[PDB]
Amino acid sequence: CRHFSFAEIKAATKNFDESRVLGVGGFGKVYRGEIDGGTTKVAIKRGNPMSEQGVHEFQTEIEMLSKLRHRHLVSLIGYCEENCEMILVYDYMAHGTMREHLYKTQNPSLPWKQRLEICIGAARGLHYLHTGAKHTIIHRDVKTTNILLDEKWVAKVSDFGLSKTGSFGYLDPEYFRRQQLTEKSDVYSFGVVLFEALCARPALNPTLAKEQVSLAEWAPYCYKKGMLDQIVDPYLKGKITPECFKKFAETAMKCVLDQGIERPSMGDVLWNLEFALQLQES
Amino acid sequence: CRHFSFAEIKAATKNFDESRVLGVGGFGKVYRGEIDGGTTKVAIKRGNPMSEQGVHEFQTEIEMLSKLRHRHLVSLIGYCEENCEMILVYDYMAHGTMREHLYKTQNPSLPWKQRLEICIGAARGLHYLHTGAKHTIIHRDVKTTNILLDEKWVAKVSDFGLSKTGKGSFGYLDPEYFRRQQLTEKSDVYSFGVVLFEALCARPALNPTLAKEQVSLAEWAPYCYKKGMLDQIVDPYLKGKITPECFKKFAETAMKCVLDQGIERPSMGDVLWNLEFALQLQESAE
Ligand SMILES: CC(=O)c1cnc2ccc(-c3cc(Cl)c(O)c(Cl)c3)nc2c1N[C@H]1CC[C@@H](CN(C)C)CC1
Ligand SMILES: CC(=O)c1cnc2ccc(-c3cc(Cl)c(O)c(Cl)c3)nc2c1N[C@H]1CC[C@@H](CN(C)C)CC1
Fold this sequence. Notes:
Chain A has 282 residues and is α+β, with helices and mostly antiparallel strands. The first copy, chain A, is built from eight helices and eight strands; from the N terminus they run E-H-E-E-E-H-E-E-H-E-E-H-H-H-H-H. It is classed as plant protein.
């Protein structure tokens, strides 16, 4: 894992210029930068060493991402810990978050096949976390702002600060009851992501009618009452084949079951999403 | 990727002591060793730097394995090319090859669930090669001697010397390759299908002494399945131990893998899912 000096980061970001700011992470700001003679675009997250939690999440990202390698995970290029700084350097994800292409945005709507391919890419990343490392890795914070899109629209999981070997609307309700650490909690959060891709609304909207506040509760309720199609993204109305719609909906439904033991594995989710894409074509 | 000096390897192997030789062949010789104050046990392949292809395969393994990280791939700990040597250091795979637990061995036969879990693990490694690296990696030499087993019987794919970005190997060769078609990851699927049939039948992929229709397992086993007699060529240890639903799922998957035309073959993700489903179909009925 590559070590940057503070001067290299300052150079890459043009001295943390305001016009390079891309947004804010948990404990600081994110900048567009370039390294290695301007040959490599990067994103650079500047954190907060005076936060106990910020330090813990910094070290957790480095411990995780310095040993993982997968097409559908955002790559950690390096870090900087000089000058009482905690800075992380990532590959540049030119199209930002999944979420900003779904709603509350001026970005155009995504075609259905592209949405399905994004969900498949994210599922491949999560499947790798659950089956491809030494031990199961539980992300703990899967959500549409933690799935980023590169210039080819390839989806990649980010934000490993809370990983182990939360966010309102994605929290596994069974955790507060059984208090067990399980990769099925990631499955639950990913089910919410699936419904977000389909319905193009936030996982949690506290202004709504009680029954609608949580997408994880509302979407299954609608599907079983035969009216999921009534809360689908208006852009997608009429664009999903019946067999694809059924397979996608059933998969997302199973992800958000009350009881982690009844939820599918991510490998099962991934296979069913690939099957759904085939059924969109046939 | 870690760089070893010749002194480190000489020390790790007790100067290539012959009581540490794990294997010997055209690849070179493989030794058991220990590194880092004796905290990490390793296998050390000392190859021949005068062979042109030996150097090519050395460089290719280093290319590939330095960038990949997966539980079901043998880890490359490091290499050494000092002193005109050509040495690779691997995590130790205490139970050796999958082939030496199937046949022509004094080793006990593998329980059926254990063979399925081994096939699933190898499938996970191949699936990673096909979908997890920056570009598709085609292993090109999947076979039962290139699936190694660690102390916990975890299966891991080895030997990337022939791999490309996209231990007899005759019985595993994709026939569509002899028709000069463009090579794809479906050639790995084909070879893996042969592995599945070996796991089931516990005989070589290619036996040149047999009746002509039995020589190639990739031809013989589908033939027997379609004639309703696959269960007659199953490993005798497995007779009566596979549930009907598991047997059918496993055999159908293997048969799709060895179809003549790659475009008709399943992806490795499809194979993997169907093997996990086969295992569940074994466990639910018992
Ligand atoms: C906008 C853009 O082009 C871009 C390009 N490449 C990136 C590469 C990595 C990360 C990244 C950001 C944060 Cl806050 C992280 O914690 C991690 Cl682990 C990675 N972000 C970007 C990135 N933008 C960030 C900026 C906003 C941030 C979340 N907001 C709260 C909504 C996430 C997305
Ligand atoms: C026996 C034992 O305990 C052991 C333990 N750990 C290992 C770890 C790695 C490798 C390995 C060997 C070769 Cl020749 C390779 O090319 C590669 Cl990539 C890895 N081999 C072993 C290994 N044995 C080797 C020695 C025989 C060799 C020849 N095959 C039958 C054909 C393959 C297996």
